[PDB]
Nucleic acid binder design. Sequence first.
RNA 1: GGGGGCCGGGCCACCCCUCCCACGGCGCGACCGCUCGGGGCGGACUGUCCCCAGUGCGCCCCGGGCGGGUCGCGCCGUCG
Length: 49
Amino acid sequence: IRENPVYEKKPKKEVKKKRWNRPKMSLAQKKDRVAQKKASFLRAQERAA
RNA sequence: GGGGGCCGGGCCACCCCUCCCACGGCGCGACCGCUCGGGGCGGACUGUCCCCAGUGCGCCCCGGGCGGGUCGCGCCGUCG
């Protein structure tokens, strides 16, 4: 340590961008999801009745 | 006493040609910024119609409606 304390930064290696976590859902998707849920609910009672 | 005046010049009045600028309108042309649809590819997600049905996103062409943006072009109007 007392001889060579200088830090040598790790050789930076470029890598292609990769997404590991889910992005935020869009309002249009959220509005559609509620619309789908309601429509499935009404059909569910329709088939049951 | 009362008058006309005395020679050139410049501008305007009229005719023809006619440059620039400003302002308004009408059209076009191209940038730039918005917007509603058609298709192609990828990618993600949703729904108790599920080998079913959707919804964003990235990207790729085509079409359409505009901005009281910007520039350029032409025409019209101004006792400019």
